[PDB]
Amino acid sequence: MSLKPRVVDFDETWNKLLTTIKAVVMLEVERATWNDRFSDIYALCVAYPEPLGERLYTETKIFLENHVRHLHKRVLESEEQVLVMYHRYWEEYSKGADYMDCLYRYLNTQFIKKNKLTEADLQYGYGGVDMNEPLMEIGELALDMWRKLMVEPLQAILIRMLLREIKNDRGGEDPNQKVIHGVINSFVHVEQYKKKFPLKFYQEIFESPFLTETGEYYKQEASNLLQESNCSQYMEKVLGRLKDEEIRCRKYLHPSSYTKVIHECQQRMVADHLQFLHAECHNIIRQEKKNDMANMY
């Protein structure tokens, strides 16, 4: 039922969603698109509902599809310019979701309360596993489509820029302490928006094969250097190049992900080696020499 028509409050709601995120996508927004969003969600909700709300998250995904094609239609493109495009995607939608949710927070509470993960796994609607039919807020869907947004331009140029930035462009500007700082910070920064996997994309997206090829390769390094490095000393050039990887990774941090590659090749290079080394241990005991024996220590 006796309440009111509840399927006539989602038609115009979706229209405002498309005329906001995509309207001022990337650039700012302004109070015009503020209340455009607000009346957007109010029409998605004031229908005067129940049927507006489901159609409300409908037009939600629809016009967020809009505002984030403002942040994704420019991904079939060329070199790191689009890496910086993904950068700006994130960066624009920072203030985007900022003012969007700040002017939209009540509807954010409103149109989500049927199908989302935090409220709904199996009880009265699903967000726990899947329906292909969620119901969730503005930063929620933000990260949701974002990870899927983290594929087309990513696979396109960001993977290749990763590629052309982890062995042999050490010189000049790499990359410098903001390039793979930001890139690997992306890997950790796309961890679960439910916070379930606060580190999965770092082992997974950045941290393991760096231990892989940095260990294998750095053993290549210690090999050739022992070819041509005057061992006096071998331990000492070891200390040199290992610190090389330490500061090379003090540009790309990416924290913890790759280094937790750092633990991974030292045990390769002095745990598949010891014999001549621990022999070099009673020599300095026999012929001193604080530096060499110390580095032995």
Partner 1 sequence: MSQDFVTLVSKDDKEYEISRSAAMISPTLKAMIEGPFRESKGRIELKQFDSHILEKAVEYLNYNLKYSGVSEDDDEIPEFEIPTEMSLELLLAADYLSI
Which residues partner with 49 through β-bridges?
Answer: 47
Site string for partner 1, 69-108 (x = CB under 8 A): --------------------------x--xx-xxx-xxxx
In the chain, the amino acid numbered 86 is Y
Work out how close the CB of 96 gets to partner 1 at its nearest, in angstroms, rounded to a whole number: 10
Alpha carbons 196 and 51: distance in angstroms, whole number: 32
Does residue 30 belong to the site contacting partner 1 (CB under 8 A)?
A: yes
Work out how close the CB of 26 gets to partner 1 at its nearest, in angstroms, rounded to a whole number: 14
Applying CB under 8 A, among 15, 19, 110, 185 the residue interacting with partner 1 is 110
Work out how close the CB of 5 gets to partner 1 at its nearest, in angstroms, rounded to a whole number: 15
The burial of 21, by beta-carbon neighbours within 10 Å (0-12 exposed, 13-18 middle, 19 or more buried), is given as: buried
* Structure-token pair, residue 72: 């994704």
Alpha carbons 246 and 237: distance in angstroms, whole number: 14
37 Rama sector, left if φ>0, alpha if ψ -120 to 50, beta otherwise: alpha
Name which of residues 210 to 249 contact partner 1 (CB under 8 A).
none
Angle at 38 between CA 37 and CA 43, to 5 degrees: 95
Nearest to partner 1 of 9, 207 (CB atom): 9
Q: Give every CB contact of residue 226 below 8 A, 6+ residues apart in sequence.
A: 234, 237
Nearest to partner 1 of 28, 79 (CB atom): 28
Work out how close the CB of 135 gets to partner 1 at its nearest, in angstroms, rounded to a whole number: 15
* Structure-token pair, residue 177: 């302490």
Residue 162 has a CB neighbour count (10 Å cut-off) of 18
Does residue 109 belong to the site contacting partner 1 (CB under 8 A)?
A: yes
Applying CB under 8 A, among 42, 210, 252, 258 the residue interacting with partner 1 is 42
Nearest to partner 1 of 57, 126 (CB atom): 57
289 Rama sector, left if φ>0, alpha if ψ -120 to 50, beta otherwise: left
Alpha carbons 228 and 234: distance in angstroms, whole number: 10
Work out how close the CB of 95 gets to partner 1 at its nearest, in angstroms, rounded to a whole number: 7
- Single out the segment in contact with partner 1 by CB under 8 A; choices: 41-49, 82-90, 128-136, 173-181: 41-49
Work out how close the CB of 110 gets to partner 1 at its nearest, in angstroms, rounded to a whole number: 5
- Contact positions toward partner 1, by CB under 8 A? 28-31, 34, 42, 45-46, 95, 98-99, 101-103, 105-110
